[PDB]
């Protein structure tokens, strides 16, 4: 079995290997990359996402989210308070202000220490989940707006034609902005490209050990667990590496820098934080190997998780027994 310790793997495809996206994902899995839940892909030196980032300041962040924490430094939840709209230029200036800017630090490990010590005492503002793309239309390789759609994959594997679309999303971050522990909708893959700015640190639990993280989360967030049998779908809970180590949960960590791709694999729980002002683009995708994970994915039916239009068909076709209850949660 390849990669039996479930380490995060890093890949350096050549320009020739960067042509065929599906083929390269299947290659990475042949080497055991999925066992970690996360892989890094460094694009060939010839590739670029677009020519420059000099003209992005007028993108609108219609609903910036202030991420307010509750709990203790290593075990907390966050809620998202909606803020007034602002442009990317306005948000960049905010991120760089004395109130929100990255503190002085020695290296990524010192910054990670400071994040876990101090996150809860601040409420950073995240421009998350903005439909759109920063890939130039002429970028033909690993252009996250030109991937094969999940609906087309389901149709190719299973023969059923379904409604829905699959488009990318932009994330504008600042110091301390945080992504809570989660797997993707329907335990899909994700791919995330860091277009510009400061790094993003990731934590990940191997898919084969995801239920260990779930059981710890039920212990640590007991009221949330009683409220919903899949409350990590709410994407609000944080658990620090120190707490994970104290409770024996297998995990790994890695820092993504500008110009790098990360792939999350089906049922790979992940969480992380931004080091400073940055912009990422991410989208979900599927492969043949995903189908079985989609069929087994948990679902939130309490009403909190509320998701996209296109998840309907995935539930309806892959999980018909759960469909009625899940749809009630959506309505
Ligand atoms: O970058 C972020 O805030 C969160 N991204 C992801 O969870 C992802 O790409 O799957
Ligand atoms: Mg602009
Ligand atoms: Ni994710
Ligand atoms: Zn729920």
Swiss-Prot record:
<keyword id="KW-0223">Dioxygenase</keyword>
<feature type="domain" description="JmjN">
    <location>
        <begin position="8"/>
        <end position="50"/>
    </location>
</feature>
<comment type="function">
    <text>Histone demethylase that specifically demethylates 'Lys-9' of histone H3, thereby playing a central role in histone code. Does not demethylate histone H3 'Lys-4', H3 'Lys-27', H3 'Lys-36' nor H4 'Lys-20'. Demethylates both di- and trimethylated H3 'Lys-9' residue, while it has no activity on monomethylated residues. Demethylation of Lys residue generates formaldehyde and succinate.</text>
</comment>
<keyword id="KW-0479">Metal-binding</keyword>
<dbReference type="GO" id="GO:0032454">
    <property type="term" value="F:histone H3K9 demethylase activity"/>
</dbReference>
<feature type="binding site">
    <location>
        <position position="270"/>
    </location>
    <ligand>
        <name>Fe cation</name>
    </ligand>
</feature>
<feature type="binding site">
    <location>
        <position position="126"/>
    </location>
    <ligand>
        <name>2-oxoglutarate</name>
    </ligand>
</feature>
<dbReference type="GO" id="GO:0005634">
    <property type="term" value="C:nucleus"/>
</dbReference>
<keyword id="KW-0408">Iron</keyword>
<protein>
    <recommendedName>
        <fullName>Lysine-specific demethylase 4D</fullName>
        <ecNumber>1.14.11.66</ecNumber>
    </recommendedName>
</protein>
<dbReference type="GO" id="GO:0072562">
    <property type="term" value="C:blood microparticle"/>
</dbReference>
<feature type="binding site">
    <location>
        <position position="200"/>
    </location>
    <ligand>
        <name>2-oxoglutarate</name>
    </ligand>
</feature>
<dbReference type="GO" id="GO:0006338">
    <property type="term" value="P:chromatin remodeling"/>
</dbReference>
<feature type="modified residue" description="PolyADP-ribosyl glutamic acid">
    <location>
        <position position="17"/>
    </location>
</feature>
<keyword id="KW-0804">Transcription</keyword>
<dbReference type="GO" id="GO:0071479">
    <property type="term" value="P:cellular response to ionizing radiation"/>
</dbReference>
<feature type="binding site">
    <location>
        <position position="184"/>
    </location>
    <ligand>
        <name>Fe cation</name>
    </ligand>
</feature>
<dbReference type="GO" id="GO:0005721">
    <property type="term" value="C:pericentric heterochromatin"/>
</dbReference>
<feature type="binding site">
    <location>
        <position position="235"/>
    </location>
    <ligand>
        <name>2-oxoglutarate</name>
    </ligand>
</feature>
<dbReference type="GO" id="GO:0000724">
    <property type="term" value="P:double-strand break repair via homologous recombination"/>
</dbReference>
<dbReference type="GO" id="GO:0140684">
    <property type="term" value="F:histone H3K9me2/H3K9me3 demethylase activity"/>
</dbReference>
<dbReference type="GO" id="GO:0001932">
    <property type="term" value="P:regulation of protein phosphorylation"/>
</dbReference>
<feature type="binding site">
    <location>
        <position position="192"/>
    </location>
    <ligand>
        <name>2-oxoglutarate</name>
    </ligand>
</feature>
<feature type="domain" description="JmjC">
    <location>
        <begin position="136"/>
        <end position="302"/>
    </location>
</feature>
<dbReference type="GO" id="GO:0035563">
    <property type="term" value="P:positive regulation of chromatin binding"/>
</dbReference>
<dbReference type="GO" id="GO:0005654">
    <property type="term" value="C:nucleoplasm"/>
</dbReference>
<dbReference type="GO" id="GO:0031490">
    <property type="term" value="F:chromatin DNA binding"/>
</dbReference>
<keyword id="KW-0805">Transcription regulation</keyword>
<keyword id="KW-0560">Oxidoreductase</keyword>
<feature type="binding site">
    <location>
        <position position="300"/>
    </location>
    <ligand>
        <name>Zn(2+)</name>
    </ligand>
</feature>
<keyword id="KW-0156">Chromatin regulator</keyword>
<feature type="binding site">
    <location>
        <position position="182"/>
    </location>
    <ligand>
        <name>Fe cation</name>
    </ligand>
</feature>
<comment type="similarity">
    <text>Belongs to the JHDM3 histone demethylase family.</text>
</comment>
<feature type="binding site">
    <location>
        <position position="234"/>
    </location>
    <ligand>
        <name>Zn(2+)</name>
    </ligand>
</feature>
<dbReference type="GO" id="GO:0010468">
    <property type="term" value="P:regulation of gene expression"/>
</dbReference>
<feature type="binding site">
    <location>
        <position position="228"/>
    </location>
    <ligand>
        <name>Zn(2+)</name>
    </ligand>
</feature>
<dbReference type="GO" id="GO:0006954">
    <property type="term" value="P:inflammatory response"/>
</dbReference>
<dbReference type="GO" id="GO:0000785">
    <property type="term" value="C:chromatin"/>
</dbReference>
<keyword id="KW-0832">Ubl conjugation</keyword>
<dbReference type="GO" id="GO:2001034">
    <property type="term" value="P:positive regulation of double-strand break repair via nonhomologous end joining"/>
</dbReference>
<keyword id="KW-0862">Zinc</keyword>
<keyword id="KW-0013">ADP-ribosylation</keyword>
């Amino acid at each position: 079995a390849q990669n039996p310790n479930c380490n995060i793997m890093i890949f350096h495809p050549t320009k020739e290997e960067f042509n065929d996206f599906d083929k390269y994902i299947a290659y990475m899995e042949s080497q055991g990359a999925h066992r970690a839940g996360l892989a890094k892909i460094i694009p060939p030196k010839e590739w670029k996402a677009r020519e420059t980032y000099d003209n992005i300041s007028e993108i609108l962040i219609a609903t910036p989210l202030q991420q307010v924490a509750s709990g203790r430094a290593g075990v907390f939840t966050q809620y998202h308070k909606k803020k007034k709209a602002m442009t990317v230029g306005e948000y960049r200036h905010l991120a760089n202000s004395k109130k929100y800017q990255t503190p002085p630090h020695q290296n990524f490990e010192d910054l990670e220490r400071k994040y876990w010590k101090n996150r809860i005492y601040n409420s950073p503002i995240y421009g998350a989940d903005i439909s759109g793309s920063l890939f130039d239309e002429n970028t033909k390789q690993w252009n996250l707006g030109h991937l094969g759609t999940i609906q087309d994959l389901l149709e190719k594997e299973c023969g059923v034609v379904i409604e829905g679309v699959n488009t990318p999303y932009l994330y504008f971050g600042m110091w301390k902005t945080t992504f809570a522990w989660h797997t993707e909708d329907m335990d899909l893959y994700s791919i995330n490209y860091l277009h510009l700015g400061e790094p993003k640190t990731w934590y990940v639990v191997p898919p084969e050990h995801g239920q260990r993280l779930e059981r710890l989360a039920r212990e640590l967030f007991p009221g949330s667990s009683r409220g919903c049998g899949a409350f990590l779908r709410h994407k609000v809970a944080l658990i620090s590496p120190t707490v994970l180590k104290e409770n024996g949960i297998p995990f790994n960590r890695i820092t993504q820098e500008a110009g790098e791709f990360m792939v999350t694999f089906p049922y790979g729980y992940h969480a992380g934080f931004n080091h400073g002002f940055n912009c990422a683009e991410a989208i979900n995708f599927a492969t043949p190997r995903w189908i079985d994970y989609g069929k087994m994915a948990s679902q939130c039916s309490c009403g909190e998780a509320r998701v996209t239009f296109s998840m309907d068909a995935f539930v309806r076709i892959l999980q018909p027994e759960r469909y009625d209850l899940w749809k009630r949660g959506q309505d």
